[PDB]
Amino acid sequence: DYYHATKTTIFNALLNTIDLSQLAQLDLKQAGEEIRDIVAELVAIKNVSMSVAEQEHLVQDIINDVLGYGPLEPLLARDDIADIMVNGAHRVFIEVGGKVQLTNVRFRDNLQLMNICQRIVSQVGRRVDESSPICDARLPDGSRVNVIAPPLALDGPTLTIRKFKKDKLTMKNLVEFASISPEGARVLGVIGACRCNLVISGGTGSGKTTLLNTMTAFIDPTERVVTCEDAAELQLQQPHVVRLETRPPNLEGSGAVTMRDLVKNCLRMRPERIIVGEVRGPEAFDLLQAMNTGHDGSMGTLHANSPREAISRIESMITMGGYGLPSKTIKEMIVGSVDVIIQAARLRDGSRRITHITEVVGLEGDVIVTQDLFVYEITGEDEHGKVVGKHRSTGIARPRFWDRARYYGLERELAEALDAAE
Amino acid sequence: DYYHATKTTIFNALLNTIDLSQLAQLDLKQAGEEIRDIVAELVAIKNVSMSVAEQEHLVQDIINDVLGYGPLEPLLARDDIADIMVNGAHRVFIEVGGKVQLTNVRFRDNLQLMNICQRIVSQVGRRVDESSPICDARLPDGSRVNVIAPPLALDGPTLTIRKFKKDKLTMKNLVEFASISPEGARVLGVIGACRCNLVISGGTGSGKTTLLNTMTAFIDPTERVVTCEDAAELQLQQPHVVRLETRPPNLEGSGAVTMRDLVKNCLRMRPERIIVGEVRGPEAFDLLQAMNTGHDGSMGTLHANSPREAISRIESMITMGGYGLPSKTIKEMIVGSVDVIIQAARLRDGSRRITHITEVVGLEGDVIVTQDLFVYEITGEDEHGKVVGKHRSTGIARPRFWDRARYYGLERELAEALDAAE
Amino acid sequence: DYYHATKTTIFNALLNTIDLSQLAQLDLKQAGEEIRDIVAELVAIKNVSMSVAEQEHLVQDIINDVLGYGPLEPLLARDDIADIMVNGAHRVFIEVGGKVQLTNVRFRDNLQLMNICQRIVSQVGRRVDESSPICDARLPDGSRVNVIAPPLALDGPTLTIRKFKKDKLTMK
């Protein structure tokens, strides 16, 4: 129990034994064996007859502290602990079973915690310190890490690790939550696979980003996706992907890099799909070009309650871009570029479901005509206020994108999904 | 007296002997030691000598102006002082015993006062001069500073320092001060505990911060709360609160961490609630994001005089954030994000009261339709000038957030408070 | 195995050997002639068992890393490789026969990749850094280059070479 004191006695000697720089040069087990030998020699010199199991545990903990991730290691390796949050050296919380729960784990001081955080976030070659007090990273394992330095967090460094749960956003989850019928799931699979241009319009609180992340899961591994986001949220798991992020202007107003810049660059980066996190300005124009230029299969979220409202929003956005384009030209661009619009909305009872899956068919009389392949129809509600509905296929056997599915060999599945939906 | 004339002569000699640039690289104590050496060098030609208790006092006074905050140093050090105000180099007033009073203290010239003000505002990286003649900031020592430059202040630069006072009220204080009726106390308890998005709009001197503290007091201890503010205005008693503070840029215009960065990070720290010390910039948009993409129950303080005014403030703030968001999009985002607005204002008699408790209902055309749950009605003035008024409920049986109450099992409390509130 | 460690040690020794100004001023052949001798002397001091052809290969790799384009150079010299795409130091893809294939060749770390990107775009006189995170250029050879800095690319620089596809879009 008192082995901690022994560690307190030995830690100071460890640095006096071998400099941390020498240990940092090698990640091989040789460092671990050397640390174990040094710890055993120090224990013998101190002449302490501590528990053998306690001695081994102390040696392992010393190795972790010197070169590992400190007391976080038992928590980090555990599979049941979804998320770990640390607020100063004294408090640690873990999200287990979907609920927060405090833990007895502790760190000696904010200095030890800061060293652990710097090691963790430098694993992926990113810096965190009082000069750059805020840092966000994604480890290769897929677990996100976020660290805030003491100069911002008044209670010392704060850290949050969120592990990667795969089956948390897949289309199976959407079907389970009744956000889309299984036939709707099949249709969504076909559309996503066949590189149909997409625009995921959604109302506030509709989880547009979650729907987009689910949709992107159908992209073939070999396609060189490129993602532009105002704030990195998308977690694509394809072997090939490039993640970009905007940079707001500094206090001087200089150094800004807006989404339009990222999309314009992406046009010249040889992508096979452009996944705009959220179209929110003139960048829409450029995105539309990406949809015509040959980067078929791009996607982009947008704020709108109904597909027609989404089209109007895109037109307004392009108009605000300052380009000398009349309404007819903008509508022509939208019709020729966009292939499908998906609408996600938050219903009265707080649930969110895919309300519309519509295909932009063409332009007539400066009015953009759309046909809804799938529509969610409200049929009733419960005494709780829960609103109930059903997904109905409009019966359009041959949507104008049918050729795309045929080229990829998904025509049969598309017909099956459209017919069996009723 | 000879003290002032001797000090002026010594200051003139020191200025003719050295310049501030000669000691800008020295620290406060090092600067004082070098100033003592320079004083000895100057006395070598002036042959000035007096009692140590007086010579050292004169040296300290000279230092207080060479690198300190000028003759304000003896005043700021005091505690009976409530407010300091400077209306030009030749006049300064101080609030003692709750009443203003003229002091014999004086400056040398308006330029010296301007330099002192520049030092005080640069203490937090701010600059006041002809380019930006108006400046406001907070000294982290616990005070608020306002400065106006000569081009606006005709009588020379004007300064105002207001020292912090620890209010830290609790809902019992508000109830006993008649700031809110007991039925209003029950309503606010429900709203706080019900995880309802809540914007505490307030006017000047309304105490829209302490109101935020007492509102937060209702937060469940098990919810991870992350608070963004400046100079740690708030003080929560929950066991799982993360406290963050923005960092003003250094004099080099670098290292700044604005509210936008802190809120965007808090989005990624898995918080159950995001609480903003005060919304005064584009961060509002990022806050609204947090208010709807989960994180139900986030709060935010805003400077506005009326709920309908506060909504316009938020809309303009989002507009100036640089996004090309269509106005209707911003209005829809606000309608779907906010669930309640609380208005705090100071009446003509100087007392703070909760004028409005309103809930955003929806959007009609391009106007946000809101219904007021509680309103404060004024009826006259009493013998001692005190404002006479009472809180009345509109009688709305089922406010929009009712669902949340049902989820949290607070329907009975809310119904009782709304019915008996008349 | 040991070749990589010996190369890393020799690279560190060369970096500490002389200032970057001497290498920059010296011509490619002029600098390489002394670099080969320095590498041979370092190997002899280390007494590393290696072949004369292996010694020449190590010298060439050292020259490429220190002053050349690093492990990306062999891909550049190839003809079948039409496009090259680096998604950070740990991922390299090449477009051959109209198909994108991952290749095992990867850089030491994102810092080396950023240095190589700056060297590549220096040919046209353009410079990329954290203050100008985006860069695009057309080298004199005709190959296009697009580079993104880490502050934007959230997983390391995103070098993208697109070699000149002559007669790609002619009237035929």
Residue numbers in the entry:
A (entry chain B), B (entry chain A): 80 to 501
C (entry chain C): 80 to 251
Paper's wording?
In the sample without exogenous nucleotides, we resolved two distinct C2 symmetric structures, which we termed “closed” and “compact” based on the distance between symmetrically positioned residue D116 on the 3HBs, to overall resolutions of 3.4 and 3.2 Å, respectively. Thirty-six percent of the hexameric particles contributed to the reconstruction of the closed state, while 64% adopted the compact state. Nucleotide densities were not observed in the cryo-EM maps. Closed state particles were no longer observed upon the addition of nucleotides, suggesting this is strictly an apo conformation. Interestingly, two chains in the closed state adopted an ATP-bound configuration despite the absence of ATP density in the unsharpened map. Lowering the threshold of the sharpened map, however, revealed residual density in the active site, which potentially fit a diphosphate. Due to this ambiguity, coupled with the ATP-bound configuration, we designated these two chains as ATP*. The closed state of CpaF, harboring two ATP* and four Apo chains, is only observed in the absence of exogenous nucleotides, suggesting that this conformation likely does not participate in processive catalysis. In addition, the spatial position of the 3HBs in the closed state indicates that association with the platform proteins is unlikely. Thus, we hypothesize that this conformation could serve as a pre-assembly state, perhaps when the ATPase is trafficking to the poles.
The ATPase CpaF in C. crescentus is the only Tad motor reported to date that is known to be bifunctional, facilitating both pilus extension and retraction at the flagellar pole through ATP hydrolysis. CpaF oligomerization is mediated by interactions between the NTD of one chain and the CAD of an adjacent chain. From these data, we propose that CpaF uses a clockwise, rotary mechanism of catalysis to assemble a right-handed, helical Tad pilus, a process broadly applicable to other single motor systems.
